[PDB]
Design an enzyme around this catalytic site. Structure first.
Site, PDB file in Angstrom:
ATOM      1  N   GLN A   1      -0.697   0.233  -3.054  1.00  0.00           N
ATOM      2  CA  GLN A   1      -2.016   1.000  -3.230  1.00  0.00           C
ATOM      3  C   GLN A   1      -1.881   2.469  -2.938  1.00  0.00           C
ATOM      4  O   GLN A   1      -2.586   3.204  -3.409  1.00  0.00           O
ATOM      5  CB  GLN A   1      -3.110   0.235  -2.264  1.00  0.00           C
TER       6      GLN A   1
ATOM      7  N   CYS B   1      -7.362  -1.544  -0.940  1.00  0.00           N
ATOM      8  CA  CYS B   1      -7.056  -2.906  -1.071  1.00  0.00           C
ATOM      9  C   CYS B   1      -7.954  -3.805  -1.841  1.00  0.00           C
ATOM     10  O   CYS B   1      -7.463  -4.748  -2.498  1.00  0.00           O
ATOM     11  CB  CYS B   1      -6.578  -3.450   0.337  1.00  0.00           C
TER      12      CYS B   1
ATOM     13  N   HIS C   1      -9.429  -6.063   5.565  1.00  0.00           N
ATOM     14  CA  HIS C   1      -8.375  -5.759   4.430  1.00  0.00           C
ATOM     15  C   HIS C   1      -8.198  -6.758   3.336  1.00  0.00           C
ATOM     16  O   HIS C   1      -7.856  -7.819   3.633  1.00  0.00           O
ATOM     17  CB  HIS C   1      -6.974  -5.627   5.060  1.00  0.00           C
TER      18      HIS C   1
ATOM     19  N   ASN D   1       0.197  -8.906  -0.827  1.00  0.00           N
ATOM     20  CA  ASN D   1      -0.335  -7.760  -0.382  1.00  0.00           C
ATOM     21  C   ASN D   1      -0.068  -6.414  -1.441  1.00  0.00           C
ATOM     22  O   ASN D   1       0.681  -6.805  -2.317  1.00  0.00           O
ATOM     23  CB  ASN D   1       0.289  -7.247   0.841  1.00  0.00           C
TER      24      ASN D   1
HETATM   25  N1  LIG Z   1      -8.505  -0.229   1.607  1.00  0.00           N
HETATM   26  C1  LIG Z   1      -9.280  -0.083   2.319  1.00  0.00           C
HETATM   27  C2  LIG Z   1     -10.365   0.104   3.348  1.00  0.00           C
HETATM   28  N2  LIG Z   1     -11.099  -1.121   3.588  1.00  0.00           N
HETATM   29  C3  LIG Z   1     -11.939  -1.915   3.033  1.00  0.00           C
HETATM   30  O1  LIG Z   1     -12.134  -1.599   1.654  1.00  0.00           O
HETATM   31  C4  LIG Z   1     -12.984  -3.193   3.387  1.00  0.00           C
HETATM   32  C5  LIG Z   1     -11.980  -4.397   2.639  1.00  0.00           C
HETATM   33  C6  LIG Z   1     -12.621  -5.736   3.186  1.00  0.00           C
HETATM   34  C7  LIG Z   1     -12.895  -5.919   4.445  1.00  0.00           C
HETATM   35  C8  LIG Z   1     -13.548  -7.197   4.687  1.00  0.00           C
HETATM   36  C9  LIG Z   1     -14.002  -7.966   3.813  1.00  0.00           C
HETATM   37  C10 LIG Z   1     -13.789  -7.732   2.385  1.00  0.00           C
HETATM   38 CL1  LIG Z   1     -14.174  -8.753   1.305  1.00  0.00          CL
HETATM   39  C11 LIG Z   1     -13.132  -6.543   2.131  1.00  0.00           C
HETATM   40  O2  LIG Z   1     -14.890  -9.087   4.205  1.00  0.00           O
HETATM   41  C12 LIG Z   1     -15.916  -9.202   4.796  1.00  0.00           C
HETATM   42  C13 LIG Z   1     -16.520  -7.790   5.468  1.00  0.00           C
HETATM   43  C14 LIG Z   1     -17.114  -7.104   4.534  1.00  0.00           C
HETATM   44  C15 LIG Z   1     -17.347  -5.857   5.329  1.00  0.00           C
HETATM   45  O3  LIG Z   1     -16.818  -4.705   4.912  1.00  0.00           O
HETATM   46  C16 LIG Z   1     -17.415  -3.776   4.046  1.00  0.00           C
HETATM   47  C17 LIG Z   1     -18.573  -3.849   3.560  1.00  0.00           C
HETATM   48  C18 LIG Z   1     -19.214  -2.804   2.790  1.00  0.00           C
HETATM   49  C19 LIG Z   1     -18.321  -1.800   2.267  1.00  0.00           C
HETATM   50  C20 LIG Z   1     -18.820  -1.024   1.242  1.00  0.00           C
HETATM   51  C21 LIG Z   1     -19.811   0.144   1.638  1.00  0.00           C
HETATM   52  N3  LIG Z   1     -18.870   1.019   1.377  1.00  0.00           N
HETATM   53  C22 LIG Z   1     -17.914   0.280   0.772  1.00  0.00           C
HETATM   54  C23 LIG Z   1     -16.942  -2.014   2.557  1.00  0.00           C
HETATM   55  C24 LIG Z   1     -16.495  -3.003   3.475  1.00  0.00           C
HETATM   56  C25 LIG Z   1     -15.164  -2.958   3.754  1.00  0.00           C
HETATM   57  O4  LIG Z   1     -14.973  -2.801   4.845  1.00  0.00           O
HETATM   58  N4  LIG Z   1     -14.116  -3.285   2.818  1.00  0.00           N
HETATM   59  C26 LIG Z   1     -11.269   1.336   3.252  1.00  0.00           C
HETATM   60  C27 LIG Z   1     -10.281   1.047   4.234  1.00  0.00           C
HETATM   61 CL   LIG Z   2      -5.403  -0.828   3.081  1.00  0.00          CL
HETATM   62 ZN   LIG Z   3      -7.127  -2.614   3.262  1.00  0.00          ZN
END
Ligand SMILES: N#CC1(NC(=O)[C@@H]2Cc3ccc(c(Cl)c3)OC/C=C/COc3ccc(C4CNC4)cc3C(=O)N2)CC1
Ligand SMILES: [Cl-]
Ligand SMILES: [Zn+2]
Ligand SMILES: [Zn+2]
Ligand SMILES: [Zn+2]
Ligand SMILES: [Zn+2]
Ligand SMILES: [Zn+2]
Ligand SMILES: [Zn+2]
Length: 220
Positions: A19, A25, A163, A187
């Site tokens: 990425q 991710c 992640h 990954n």
């Molecule tokens: N690369 C990378 C980064 N990390 C993410 O993109 C993470 C990945 C993720 C984490 C937990 C997950 C899932 Cl399915 C995905 O499971 C359940 C938890 C979900 C809660 O997390 C969110 C709620 C909402 C959002 C949206 C509002 N802003 C985007 C975003 C997230 C988020 O944090 N996404 C930016 C550093």
């Molecule tokens: Cl990441």
């Molecule tokens: Zn990530």
């Protein structure tokens, strides 16, 4: 369910990607799942555009390089009515204005399925459906610098997943502690990380790092 599964050898899984310096991710996890299902459907393995997700899935609630959710990307695809290939709309580890071109769409989805939030339900999904999008608690240096073996981190949280990655299968290995079932995880940090870009995450040790907690796939 079988004792072992590996979709990689059935031709369901593209090269490991990187990425880079973008919090995307979620998009790699999403394309990898959609790639597996398009292949189940057409018999053809085509790399999908993460960029296309990064740039355009904002109305579905993704935040580009600031993060997103796999479910959000699957809806985008559904609402958009298609998704461009990787080579038509190549990955640039940034966010730019939406450039989606229906002409180069190579993938579609009719929604998505959330899997029951425990490991046995996940094992059946992986067994019968194919590569499955999942989030883990990757926020520990042991994971950032993972090399080989079954990954087990003592303060990993079943609830603090941060992640998105891709379960491409699962199996088992000899170990001193006889805890040796693993999940086979793809990954998006490059080939040089883990074992060619993959980690073996402990399996059936109490939903370790919360791998079974946020698992979904798109329906095609
Ligand atoms: N690369 C990378 C980064 N990390 C993410 O993109 C993470 C990945 C993720 C984490 C937990 C997950 C899932 Cl399915 C995905 O499971 C359940 C938890 C979900 C809660 O997390 C969110 C709620 C909402 C959002 C949206 C509002 N802003 C985007 C975003 C997230 C988020 O944090 N996404 C930016 C550093
Ligand atoms: Cl990441
Ligand atoms: Zn990530
Ligand atoms: Zn790509
Ligand atoms: Zn550009
Ligand atoms: Zn979901
Ligand atoms: Zn830790
Ligand atoms: Zn943690």
């Amino acid at each position: 369910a079988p004792r072992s599964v590996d979709w990689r050898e059935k031709g369901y899984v593209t090269p490991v990607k990187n990425q880079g310096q973008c919090g995307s991710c979620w998009a790699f996890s999403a394309t990898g799942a959609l790639e597996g299902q398009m292949f189940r459907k057409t018999g053809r393995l085509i790399s999908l555009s993460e960029q296309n997700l990064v740039d355009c899935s904002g109305p579905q609630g993704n935040e580009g390089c600031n993060g997103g959710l796999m479910d959000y990307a699957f809806q985008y695809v559904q609402d958009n009515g298609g998704l461009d290939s990787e080579e038509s709309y190549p990955y640039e580890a940034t966010e730019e204005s939406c450039k989606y071109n229906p002409k180069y769409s190579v993938a579609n989805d009719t929604g998505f399925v959330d899997i029951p939030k425990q490991e046995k339900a996940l094992m059946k999904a992986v067994a019968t459906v194919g590569p499955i999008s999942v989030a883990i608690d990757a926020g520990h240096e042991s994971f950032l610098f993972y090399k080989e073996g079954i990954y087990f981190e003592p303060d990993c949280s079943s609830e603090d997943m941060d992640h998105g990655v891709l379960v491409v299968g699962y199996g088992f290995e000899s170990t001193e502690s006889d805890n040796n079932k693993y999940w086979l995880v793809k990954n998006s940090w490059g080939e040089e990380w883990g074992m060619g870009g993959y980690v073996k995450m402990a399996k059936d040790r109490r939903n370790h790092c919360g791998i079974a907690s946020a698992a979904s796939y798109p329906t095609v």
